[PDB]
Ligand binder design. Structure first.
Ligand SMILES: CC(=O)N[C@@H]1[C@@H](O[C@@H]2O[C@H](C(=O)O)[C@@H](O[C@@H]3O[C@H](CO)[C@@H](O)[C@H](O[C@@H]4O[C@H](C(=O)O)[C@@H](O[C@@H]5O[C@H](CO)[C@@H](O)[C@H](O[C@@H]6O[C@H](C(=O)O)[C@@H](O[C@@H]7O[C@H](CO)[C@@H](O)[C@H](O[C@@H]8OC(C(=O)O)=C[C@H](O)[C@H]8O)[C@H]7NC(C)=O)[C@H](O)[C@H]6O)[C@H]5NC(C)=O)[C@H](O)[C@H]4O)[C@H]3NC(C)=O)[C@H](O)[C@H]2O)[C@H](O)[C@@H](CO)O[C@H]1O
Ligand SMILES: CC(=O)N[C@@H]1[C@@H](O[C@@H]2O[C@H](C(=O)O)[C@@H](O[C@@H]3O[C@H](CO)[C@@H](O)[C@H](O[C@@H]4O[C@H](C(=O)O)[C@@H](O[C@@H]5O[C@H](CO)[C@@H](O)[C@H](O[C@@H]6O[C@H](C(=O)O)[C@@H](O[C@@H]7O[C@H](CO)[C@@H](O)[C@H](O[C@@H]8OC(C(=O)O)=C[C@H](O)[C@H]8O)[C@H]7NC(C)=O)[C@H](O)[C@H]6O)[C@H]5NC(C)=O)[C@H](O)[C@H]4O)[C@H]3NC(C)=O)[C@H](O)[C@H]2O)[C@H](O)[C@@H](CO)O[C@H]1O
Ligand SMILES: CC(=O)N[C@@H]1[C@@H](O[C@@H]2O[C@H](C(=O)O)[C@@H](O[C@@H]3O[C@H](CO)[C@@H](O)[C@H](O[C@@H]4O[C@H](C(=O)O)[C@@H](O[C@@H]5O[C@H](CO)[C@@H](O)[C@H](O[C@@H]6O[C@H](C(=O)O)[C@@H](O[C@@H]7O[C@H](CO)[C@@H](O)[C@H](O[C@@H]8OC(C(=O)O)=C[C@H](O)[C@H]8O)[C@H]7NC(C)=O)[C@H](O)[C@H]6O)[C@H]5NC(C)=O)[C@H](O)[C@H]4O)[C@H]3NC(C)=O)[C@H](O)[C@H]2O)[C@H](O)[C@@H](CO)O[C@H]1O
Ligand SMILES: CC(=O)N[C@@H]1[C@@H](O[C@@H]2O[C@H](C(=O)O)[C@@H](O[C@@H]3O[C@H](CO)[C@@H](O)[C@H](O[C@@H]4OC(C(=O)O)=C[C@H](O)[C@H]4O)[C@H]3NC(C)=O)[C@H](O)[C@H]2O)[C@H](O)[C@@H](CO)O[C@H]1O
Ligand SMILES: CC(=O)N[C@@H]1[C@@H](O[C@@H]2O[C@H](C(=O)O)[C@@H](O[C@@H]3O[C@H](CO)[C@@H](O)[C@H](O[C@@H]4OC(C(=O)O)=C[C@H](O)[C@H]4O)[C@H]3NC(C)=O)[C@H](O)[C@H]2O)[C@H](O)[C@@H](CO)O[C@H]1O
Lengths: 361, 361, 361
């Protein structure tokens, strides 16, 4: 039972009014399409007989893997360290800065600049301008001006200057001059306040010869110059005092040596010369005396004894009675006592009485 | 022309219908127009539709995201590891060696004079000016002399612990001044303590044309008993003073000037005063003499020559015979010789040689 | 009421079957359940199926796996070879410069005072103490004075090669002491060698209240010929010594003789003043010098000589020249007198030849 269906060309159906029954199939001889029938509608307006639709296609494949990445950044640059090097130089053998500048700083502060020290020869040259205790030579004026320095007056250790020769031969001091002339003496002592209760020079001699000795030497031409000259203006005291304790010798010994051999050269020369004068100005005169002999305690010796070649020629005794030597003279009359023995001077009351007592008887 | 109709339902009515299509019989969906065939042993639900083919495969996927950037390579190795090959190597020559330098400094610390061990110029100076100079100075203390085996010569020209030589300089050798109202000692003092001392205390060897030594006491405000020179001796075997002279035409010249204008002020004054005394500490008496004139060689001049206004008034001659001037007196008797001249005193042996020679015849 | 089934084979058997479907006849596959229409002139194998339309395209695929991480970057650049850019560079600042130091050291050795060329503190002192100080000292050698153009003044107030001023200090100016048993010279010595020296050797300008110059010889163990003062002159034209005074009372020169012993007759040969006139020591034939010479160029009214003993007058010469004895005298000769005009006056011979021949009657 091979059944064929109602069929036309695909176009012939569209132009046809033939109505297929509800359930009757209609065919398109072109391409093979087909539809059913709606028993009251033309072929154009009725459903075809297709299937639903196929299922969903498979999901696509998986994409190609991504490209490999880019090269990372370059490494950081190298570093060079001192300590890890080889042949490092030894720094120890180098002088530290601070320690050195400190050593030098202490040196400039602790050491003696040349300009602040005397050299050996500089020290010497300035020393030789100074007196030494082993000797020296002073050319200038050496003044002494003590002041509350406790200078004691002892005649053994004191004095502003003290020379002690008890352990050394020689002299203490010499003052020598070879000058023809000058304008002043050598040594000078002076006190100006008349209340000064002390001496100018003091000599406490113990020894075996002349204590103080003054000598004038024989001059070329003689002239009036004395070896010692004393002068006083104190009217209440003698100009000079001499005391002695001689046993057999004179306390003051004056001697006159003849300058010439011929005996009569020194006929006007004396051993002791006295001259009494008046005031050298307003003076009216003088009643002064020449020689004053006395023995306030009383003597038995002769108050004056003139001699010549050790032979007596004139003397006065303690009684006051003199004894001449040769022929004398009196320019006057001599008052005597009555002659009581064959030699006694004859008065006049003797010559008369014995002239008249021969009253022839 | 047997028009065949087929089995047909609505799309829903098929699912709930029990109609079993025969093996090959067609079934219709009056809705969708879909259709299936038959299994003659199955409901419509279980008969497979007439689906279409499967759709095509989906597009291939995209492409993966690019990979991450790579990692940083390792850091570079250091340059050189030997010191010698480095660049800009420092010049070590410009650095001071340690030992060589500390030795240089040490030689200085040993060769130079610390300040604390040397007097400065000003430190030395202050001690220099405290010492005596040869150009002058001012001594405030006591300058003692104590020579000992120092070769002090005794020469009167160069010796002495002090020697002053003014042969090339005007002025005085030494001056000793005091303006004090009072003190407890003199100025200059000479003293010898060993009574065996065989030398002088002071020696003056003067050669010149004026007074060698000159002593003057000046006029005091109020007079008193003070002498310009005072001599004292306790050596019983020698004179207290010695004077020798060679005067051609007086050896010792004594002069008394009247202190006042009035002629009789000095009425009790003498030029030379003598006194003979006993021992002051138990003396019984004295047999000493006053004045002793002599001429061991023999003189022709007068042993005593008194004058007044240069007019002779009394003199003793070398013969021993005096010669008065005016009227005298004898409180006693004068023994004389028999008168062998027209003048001459009368004895008694010549008054009575004539008083008897006139017998009566 | 007939039900039509269609022509059907297995799905494979159709492809290998020669059956030709009629135009519109449907053919069935007993397998898959598919079916096709007819071509009226085609085998089943070459006939379009009766399916629905094509399914839709599948979903796009997923995204590929992300790419791998990149490769490690290149190595870093190498380290540096310059000293300045090194790491852990040593600090050179702490090192002393060579030249700056060698310059510092050189300047020091030239600017500072080597030890061997300067006296130490102790050497300067040891050499200082050998020099005299102005506050005191002990001179052991000879201190010479040799002034020359030194402006040495001669003033008796400030001048002199040495000048001592004690106006501000108690005590003595100068002391010369000796304790030696014997020596070869005196202490102080003054000497002028040119006999033209027109000035004095020593000068004492004293103002005060006691003895100006004071000389003392002390009692020796054994007495001997030693004088406290000794004058000697060789000038035939000038006195050896000069004394001037202005005394109101007392003698200008006071001589006193004290007996050394208690026995009254111990000093029987001793005098106060001793005079001796002698010749020249080298050939004198004699001398005509005088002993004592009193005169008063101004004229005196007092007595030229007044001898006393126990303060009672015993002999005196007056200004007239008339003496006055005390007791009995003697004349080894004849005494020329005047004719007696009074009863006591001595009688001559022409007075005893007179009153005799007046008895020639
Ligand atoms: C013509 C006529 O007839 N006219 C009549 C008139 O007669 C005349 O009258 C004159 C008149 O007016 O006076 C008269 O002149 C005096 O004659 C006498 C004769 O006896 C003279 O002696 C006197 O001269 C001197 O004058 C002075 C003076 O004026 O001041 C007296 O004073 C003395 O001055 C000196 C100067 O400064 C002093 O130094 C001195 O002091 C003493 O020093 C001693 C000393 O050496 O240090 C002391 O003693 C101890 O000494 C021993 C010595 O060995 C030492 O060892 C001690 O030291 C110790 O010892 C030692 C040691 O040895 O190793 C170690 C220890 O460590 C040490 O400490 C000494 N002591 C100490 C301190 O330690 C002593 O204490 C001091 O005092 C001072 N005094 C003395 C005593 O010397 C002198 O004394 C005196 O001699 C004449 N004066 C004057 C003014 O002229 C004539 O002689 C007459 O003919 C009639 O008088 C009048 C009426 O009466 O009428 C007229 O008409
Ligand atoms: C009243 C009465 O009639 N009473 C009677 C009594 O009479 C009295 O009795 C007295 C008595 O007791 O004797 C009598 O005599 C005098 O008495 C007193 C004292 O006693 C004096 O008036 C006198 O004595 C004088 O003084 C002293 C003294 O006595 O103390 C004598 O001694 C002298 O002392 C000084 C000090 O020490 C000595 O220095 C001196 O020696 C000399 O020194 C010189 C010196 O400068 O040091 C020396 O000259 C240098 O020599 C050398 C050597 O070569 C040369 O080289 C130098 O030259 C220089 O050389 C060089 C060189 O070498 O590089 C470089 C230069 O270019 C160059 O210049 C010389 N220097 C020069 C030239 O510048 C010299 O050699 C030394 O000798 C010492 N003298 C001596 C001799 O040792 C004095 O000599 C003496 O004058 C007594 N005499 C006299 C005439 O007055 C009284 O006259 C009477 O009143 C009766 O006696 C008794 C009897 O019973 O009875 C009574 O009644
Ligand atoms: C046997 C017989 O009968 N004989 C006869 C025989 O005799 C002759 O006659 C005499 C006799 O018969 O006895 C005797 O001869 C003389 O007798 C006198 C007796 O007095 C003797 O003095 C004399 O010796 C002479 O003495 C004088 C003297 O008087 O001093 C000496 O002269 C002086 O010499 C020294 C050495 O050169 C000098 O130092 C001195 O110069 C003066 O010194 C003054 C002073 O005082 O210091 C100074 O004045 C100062 O000046 C200044 C400036 O104005 C002031 O600043 C100072 O003032 C002070 O200033 C201050 C201050 O500045 O802040 C503070 C104060 O407030 C203030 O005051 C002044 N003054 C002071 C205090 O500083 C200055 O330096 C000078 O002016 C000098 N001048 C003086 C003082 O005059 C002589 O050197 C000395 O010779 C006897 N002569 C001799 C040679 O020995 C003899 O026996 C015989 O000559 C007959 O010849 C014969 C004939 O036939 O017959 C016989 O019978
Ligand atoms: C008339 C008469 O005087 N008699 C005759 C005598 O004349 C005097 O003799 C004495 C004499 O030689 O005995 C002498 O005296 C000295 O004469 C001078 C001048 O008159 C006189 O200056 C003397 O004193 C001196 O004075 C001075 C001075 O500078 O002033 C220094 C002397 O140191 C000092 O002595 C005086 N007296 C002395 C002490 O000598 C002199 O001859 C006459 O005055 C005469 O010489 C003889 C003849 O042979 O005959 C007598 O009749
Ligand atoms: C014109 C005349 O001569 N007058 C008669 C007078 O003669 C004088 O007598 C006095 C006297 O005895 O006092 C004598 O005095 C001596 O000389 C002077 C001054 O008097 C003086 O040296 C002495 O007097 C005393 O000396 C002393 C001492 O201790 O020695 C201390 C006193 O300072 C002082 O008062 C004295 N003698 C001595 C030792 O120096 C004087 O020389 C006589 O000329 C006479 O005494 C009377 C009668 O009795 O008559 C007058 O007309």
């Amino acid at each position: 039972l091979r059944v064929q269906f109602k069929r036309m060309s695909a176009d012939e159906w569209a132009r046809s009014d033939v109505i297929l029954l509800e359930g009757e199939i209609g065919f398109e001889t072109d391409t093979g399409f087909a539809k059913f029938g709606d028993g009251q509608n033309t072929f154009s307006k009725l459903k075809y007989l297709t299937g639903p639709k196929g299922p969903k296609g498979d999901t696509g494949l998986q994409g190609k893997t991504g490209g490999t990445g880019p090269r990372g950044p370059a490494g950081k640059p190298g570093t060079t360290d001192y300590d890890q090097l080889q042949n490092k130089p030894d720094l120890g053998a180098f002088a530290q800065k601070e320690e050195t500048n400190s050593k030098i700083t202490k040196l400039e502060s602790s050491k003696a600049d040349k300009s602040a020290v005397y050299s050996k020869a500089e020290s010497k040259i300035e020393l030789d301008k100074k007196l030494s205790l082993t000797g020296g030579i002073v050319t200038g004026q050496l003044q002494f001006k003590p002041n509350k320095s406790g200078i004691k007056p002892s005649s053994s250790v004191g004095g502003a200057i003290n020379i002690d020769m008890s352990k050394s031969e020689g002299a203490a001091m010499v003052m020598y001059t070879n000058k023809d002339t000058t304008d002043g003496p050598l040594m000078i002592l002076r006190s100006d306040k008349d209340t000064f209760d002390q001496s100018a020079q003091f000599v406490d001699y113990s020894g075996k010869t002349n204590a103080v000795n003054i000598v004038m030497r024989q001059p070329s031409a003689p002239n009036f110059s004395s070896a010692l000259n004393i002068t006083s203006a104190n009217e209440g005291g003698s100009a000079m005092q001499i005391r002695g304790v001689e046993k057999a010798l004179g306390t003051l010994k004056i001697t006159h040596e003849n300058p010439n051999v011929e005996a009569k050269y020194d006929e006007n020369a004396a051993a002791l010369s006295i001259d009494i004068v008046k005031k050298q100005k307003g003076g009216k005169g003088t009643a002064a005396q020449g020689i004053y002999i006395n023995s306030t305690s009383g003597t038995a010796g002769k108050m004056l004894r003139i001699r010549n070649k050790n032979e007596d020629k004139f003397y006065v005794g303690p009684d006051g009675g003199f004894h001449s030597g040769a022929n004398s003279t009196v320019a006057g009359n001599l008052t005597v006592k009555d002659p009581t023995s064959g030699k006694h001077a004859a008065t006049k009351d003797y010559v008369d009485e014995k002239i008249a007592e021969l009253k022839k008887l």
